Design a protein around this ligand. Structure first.
Ligand code: NA
Ligand code: NA
Ligand code: NA
Ligand code: NA
Ligand SMILES: [Zn+2]
Ligand SMILES: [Zn+2]
Lengths: 291, 289
């Protein structure tokens, strides 16, 4: 086994090793709650638990493409309520920024649509935004598909004026992958390439309860260490790979439970980067508060 | 066709007052005993998996594995001594299942806990399937000896910190709990084939449903049988638990403390007064020696 001890210290020792040259990050809504965006499945605070004032047939409807096509108002009410005044990336995003700067980041597969990975300084080459993004929008008609920038959409969303294409008066939706829409081709191409060479998997703020994303933890070589930084164990045992932190055959999986920012701080310190990470977060947070 | 009128606690309680709901099966786990001061296994920070450092185990699950226990039984008995609950006082949830017994509604209680609080709350053996055994009785481990020992013996040996060894054959005497790697009792399977043909409601409480074959029990239920979960968090997601999809039809999740969920359910059923009275009286009766 590549790790000497199934701990955060073991993972950090490994990250200092020579064979650990390509790290893949898998991240979810948990890495953004510190930036004031709540997750989906945390009880009480999650979105599933605060969707009653929309009067939905079922909670998931607000995320279903077909329902959105027949009653988009609720999704856009949610978009207006959840629009973040400031898109301020967290300590976790900037830890992935450090991984980019040290040549360790092969890819960040993100399930979030908040584009905080871009604001933290990850580039498109670095990213697989598996569920799309809110940054750009498109008309839904197969013969229209007129694109619209975030400025336009934002103005409509806050004006509670349902986004309709100017030319065909159709529905214009953020380029998010609603339930029932296929993932970007980039997801599959990048997957087939990246997971042949990956040396370390960094799973953060995700419950691994939505496929096909979670199965990504199963594509890694059987020797690639997997560190989970998350409030709770996830990915154990719907699923095809299997996080094994505690059994008699466990050898490569490590779970560090707690806040994503706190775990990134501990990991950085272990690697001697805590100082640089705090400085980077400080500088960028101050710089953003200038626009 | 959606035996529940609405996927809520109120819908489930309406169903329970209906004529069609005559058989309730309870599936419960460590979560129903944390109010009684016994912690669960997989809760972060407070769970047993997160507090096994002082036993110096090769791996967290080893403390519960039959093979490790047979070769390194000292850590399990240290945990047994330190985890032995000073008072065995069932929680409001146990007594709510007692209310279910008294109203003729309880077909069976399948429990994963070994603390026997379901008996102290007044469920009888015919009411119970202790799927993972109990601490109440112990046996020597030799396949030809199998001499039984009562809890008095065990309590005394555990607290005097002397590894329990058989008087006749000097082998290891372990509690009759189902360690990882031991088969479940035949009662589990018999009772299952019968109970899940006539069950009208599933009550899953204080369990993460992450251990097999217990968790699959929610799959033996008829496709029409409603299933309500009372738990701090969604778990179990026939079929699995479908609370939120467009196809959800029979599953209801009430997130929170098991005791509070039992209180709310009882109130909807008009039993809250009786439940609180029973809890107070039984706590007082047990404290009176
Ligand atoms: Na969760
Ligand atoms: Na997400
Ligand atoms: Na849990
Ligand atoms: Na289902
Ligand atoms: Zn259009
Ligand atoms: Zn013996």
């Amino acid at each position: 086994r590549l790790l000497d001890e199934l701990t955060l210290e073991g993972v950090a020792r490994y990250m200092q090793s020579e064979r650990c040259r390509r790290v893949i990050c898998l991240v979810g809504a948990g890495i953004s709650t510190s930036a004031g965006i709540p997750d989906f499945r945390s009880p009480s605070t999650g979105l599933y638990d605060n969707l009653e004032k929309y009067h939905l047939p079922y909670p998931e409807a607000i995320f279903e493409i077909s329902y959105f096509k027949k009653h988009p108002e609720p999704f856009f009410a949610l978009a207006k309520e959840l629009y973040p005044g400031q898109f301020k990336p967290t300590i976790c995003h900037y830890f992935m920024r450090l991984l980019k700067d040290k040549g360790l980041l092969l890819r960040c597969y993100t399930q979030n649509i908040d584009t905080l990975e871009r604001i933290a300084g990850l580039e498109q080459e670095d990213l697989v935004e598996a569920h799309g993004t809110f940054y750009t929008s498109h008309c839904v008609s197969a013969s229209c598909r007129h694109e619209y920038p975030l400025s336009w959409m934002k103005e409509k969303i806050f004006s509670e004026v349902t986004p309709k294409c100017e030319d065909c008066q159709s529905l214009v939706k953020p380029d998010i992958v609603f339930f029932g829409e296929s993932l970007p081709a980039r997801f599959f191409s990048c997957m087939q390439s990246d997971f042949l060479k990956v040396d370390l998997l960094l799973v953060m703020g995700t419950s691994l309860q939505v496929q096909p994303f979670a199965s990504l933890i199963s594509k890694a070589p059987l020797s690639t260490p997997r560190l989970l930084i998350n409030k709770e164990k996830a990915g154990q045992s719907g699923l095809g790979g299997g996080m094994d932190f505690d059994s008699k055959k466990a050898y490569r999986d490590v779970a560090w439970l707690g806040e994503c920012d706190q775990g990134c701080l501990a990991l950085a310190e272990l690697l001697g980067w805590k100082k640089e990470l705090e400085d980077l977060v400080r500088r960028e947070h101050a710089s953003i508060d200038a626009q």
